[PDB]
Amino acid sequence: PLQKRLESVRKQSSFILTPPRRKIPQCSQLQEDVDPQKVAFLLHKQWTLYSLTPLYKFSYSNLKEYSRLLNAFIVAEKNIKVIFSTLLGMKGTQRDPEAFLVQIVSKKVLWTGWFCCVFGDSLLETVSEDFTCLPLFLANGAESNTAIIGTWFQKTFDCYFSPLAINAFNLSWMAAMWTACKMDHYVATTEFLWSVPCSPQSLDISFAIHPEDAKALWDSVHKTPGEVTQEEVDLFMDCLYSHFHRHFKIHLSATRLVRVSTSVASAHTDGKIKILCHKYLIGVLAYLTELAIFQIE
Amino acid sequence: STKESKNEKLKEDLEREQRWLDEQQQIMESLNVLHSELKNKVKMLNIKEYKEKLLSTLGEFLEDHFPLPDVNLITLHEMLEILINRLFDVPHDPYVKISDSFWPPYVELLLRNGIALRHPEDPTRIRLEAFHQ
Amino acid sequence: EDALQMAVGYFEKGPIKASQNKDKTLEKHLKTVENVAWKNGLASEEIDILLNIALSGKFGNAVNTRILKCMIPATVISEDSVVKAVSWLCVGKCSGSTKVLFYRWLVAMFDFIDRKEQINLLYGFFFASLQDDALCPYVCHLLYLLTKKENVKPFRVRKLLDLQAKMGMQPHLQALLSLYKFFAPALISVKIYFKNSENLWKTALLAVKQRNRGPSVIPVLNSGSFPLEQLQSFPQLLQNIHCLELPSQMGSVLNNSLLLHYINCVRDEPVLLRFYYWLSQTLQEECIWYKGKEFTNFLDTIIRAECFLQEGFYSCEAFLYKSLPLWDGLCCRSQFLQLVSWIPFSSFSEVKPLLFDHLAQLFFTSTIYFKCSVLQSLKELLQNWLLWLSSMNSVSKLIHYVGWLSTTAMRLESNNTFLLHFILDFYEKVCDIYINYNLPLVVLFPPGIFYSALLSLDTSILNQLCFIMHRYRKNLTAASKTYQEFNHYLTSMVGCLWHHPSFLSYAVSFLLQWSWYLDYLFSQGLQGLKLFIRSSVHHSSIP
Amino acid sequence: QASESKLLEIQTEKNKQKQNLQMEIKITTVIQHVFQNLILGSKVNWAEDPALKEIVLQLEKNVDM
């Protein structure tokens, strides 16, 4: 059945094909079904990433039942309440299932969980009808609450959250991706963070570039319009490294990139995401949505 | 030494194989007999026999354990019959008025044991608990 | 009599006259009972007597309490005793603390009652005790274990909802209500801890019997379909195989062979994906956390389950594909090499680029014992593939590849016979394709191994070569260039045989102890040699 | 293989079969509950009475079966 062709497709999945070019996201206003207040609460906040196997027998109707079940589990673990909400307009395609939010309110929200999937169809192409595919989870709150919610979900839907990790290659690619994005209001200078590998804690280089200089350098190293290519990313990194070495005769290339921040969003290797501008928000998710699939497959 | 080790390993694996074979055997006879029983198998009269048996035994139990002392009182059987009849004849008003023929101990007995329920405002009326819903 | 039967009779006689020395007598009898109960347990009959004596109005509250606290079975508990106990509870002349203790005992001794159907018939009497708020938690804990799908009636759901509204969302009420929702979701919209559930009767022998009653890496199992918790015996599975329900998590299926029996034939698509993602992510998290004994034990359990079902898993296959290039060869070598044995049949054109390349990478550079190890793994794979099939180009290419590895390593190790033994054993396992699986395909071992082994210096090598050519001849006569090479080899060994240096040992013994000396060799234990020289060469059929 | 085929066929066939009577079912349920509540209220040791014992076990039967 689905298992056989799924075996074949992950057999074909080898590190031999060239990395495909990616289309630069364009300035896109928030969708009509998207509530500005809900995303405004979501944006300008820190989120922890989690990859998820597809939900088993998940229904969007019995949300109150889920809320009361989580409340019962929490009180069993022990003036708080659990609220389930349905959020429209942030699905990449019609194939991607509807997204929803879970909140913990102390009768002041303390813990928020977001389940979503944008442009994620390969998982949806290899799944049966019973399952719901929202492999992207964003957590914001206390770690104990996150662990409790994860335990409940493991017991209920037969799934786990895996802490999604981002390497230097992916982080550099996404850095180039958002520095390709056009921002009308440069409200945050781009900034990169590094960490020298050493058992005792050592120097952590932070390198910041003025947004105008960064955009000019990007357009200088921008060849294919509306698209980003591996050669563009490599030359971007090479130019930064050459500038750093010309300044200080220090090979930054022998250091691990750990955090990249720009005007629109910021990412960290451990799985920290900060979002500022809505105009590219959706596209952001799509990119990181691929990483969940790449962790599932 | 490898030769011995594999000899006892194969002996253990063979014993496990006979264990699994034996277990799946009775698994097979159980599955086959269940399939045959379902094939051979494939209501009103059964329910009627049960209802009549239950009613006769209930009447005997009532006469043996809830007798009248000696106005004209009715038996607890007739009271239960009136309640059951009104419960299904008038599903929108199953209350029956309490007359002098209702022995007050019987009414209180039906009230204590959750069988009869009092009207929220009219004390002279009681209904039967709808156990079917 | 016997020491205990005297006490049982004394308690059957009921309370006696005014106490002159009767307190001491009652104490002696009660002490004898509890001593027997706490040493090895009580029989069903004695329990049937004493439980109903305690739940009756006879004797005071202390005597009944001690009797209840010493109602520990040595084997099982009769359900008729429990029925009579429920009747005694219905009588009403029982103490409230005694009722609480009896419900606690019924919950604690639930898995020691021989049958529970007649007890489930008393579900109405059990449910009507929810009105009492002193028995409510214990009655809820009992109903949580006793409830089947047939017991979830609309009236009971309504009354339980009203009781929840009266008392609030109590933990026991919420557990019972969640069970009712699981059994009947349509009536609601229109492994759980209970307080005071400490096992007061937990002796050591009762503990060993409770652990014998069970025939986190593994998730804790959470439940007219048969409830999964009630599945505790093989006859129960035999009776209820048709009406089984899939668990919320099937990890407990691994260490519970009862559900494995239904898994073997369920052939359900969704559970396949559910177990695939489960085991794959479990393998990923265990591997990342390792960098060990618990991981080894978990993989051993996986291998044991893999021995059953007579077919390989795919999560393990994907994990091994991902980790083989990164594999050092010594992290969990014992665990890895047993998974390659159970690999699904596939054409020998996609596995080699992804799987066998790193296998050869390790093989050409790792220890000779590791070479014998991977040889055993591949011969087990060949056995499994032939068993499953019972196409031919794939196995032919696999045999050619393993033979190339064989000859290369045979050169590599300065012609060490330790690997030669595994080579020859593998080839014996190969040599029976036509007669074991009805497959008209015979592959011939390379001449390098032929000449290295045939004229080798070890006698057991000569033995197993005689055996292997005898089997090859038997297979050939059972059903072009293959026959020519076989005849050339036969001429080669008949020229080499009737001397051989490997037999000089025997000759020295022949000097220590007769024109015909082959009989002494035969008595030394060369029975394969008789088989080869009597039924294969046919040049001198007579001994 | 034989067991897989047998389970497949039995499952397929099992899915394949898948004013008086209804009101009589309701009345029989009501009578069951009334009898049980009366037996409970009488406080009778029903296990001592053989007929009462074998009838108490007749209760808790789904009439719609």
Side-chain angles (χ1 to χ4, degrees), chain C residues 80 87 124 150 153 156 265, chain D residues 4 7 45 47 53 60 62:
Chain C
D80 185 64
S87 183
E150 296 77 14
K153 298 183 177 182
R156 290 167 173 169
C265 299
Chain D
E4 164 66 30
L7 182 52
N45 204 336
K53 181 180 181 181
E60 192 50 35
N62 290 84

Side-chain angles (χ1 to χ4, degrees), chain D residues 2-13:
Chain D
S3 55
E4 164 66 30
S5 52
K6 282 285 302 305
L7 182 52
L8 169 63
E9 65 200 73
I10 191 56
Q11 183 65 40
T12 51
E13 64 189 293

Side-chain angles (χ1 to χ4, degrees), chain C residues 80 83-84 86-88 90-91 118 120-125 128 150-151 153 155-156 265-267, chain D residues 3-4 7 11 32-33 36-37 39-40 43-48 53 56-62:
Chain C
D80 185 64
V83 172
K84 295 186 301 182
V86 174
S87 183
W88 276 114
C90 294
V91 175
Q118 288 197 340
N120 184 268
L121 296 179
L122 309 176
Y123 196 95
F125 296 91
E150 296 77 14
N151 310 122
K153 298 183 177 182
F155 174 83
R156 290 167 173 169
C265 299
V266 57
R267 213 76 279 179
Chain D
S3 55
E4 164 66 30
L7 182 52
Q11 183 65 40
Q32 283 182 337
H33 277 78
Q36 191 173 230
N37 290 345
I39 294 177
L40 251 179
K43 298 183 179 181
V44 172
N45 204 336
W46 46 267
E48 311 284 77
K53 181 180 181 181
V56 159
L57 303 176
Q58 291 292 330
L59 301 175
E60 192 50 35
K61 282 184 181 179
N62 290 84

Side-chain angles (χ1 to χ4, degrees), chain B residues 43-51, chain D residues 20-22 24-25 65:
Chain B
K43 177 185 178 182
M44 304 178 57
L45 208 59
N46 299 322
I47 298 314
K48 287 194 183 189
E49 290 154 359
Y50 183 75
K51 173 184 176 181
Chain D
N20 52 332
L21 183 59
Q22 201 74 225
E24 280 177 3
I25 292 172
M65 289 299 298

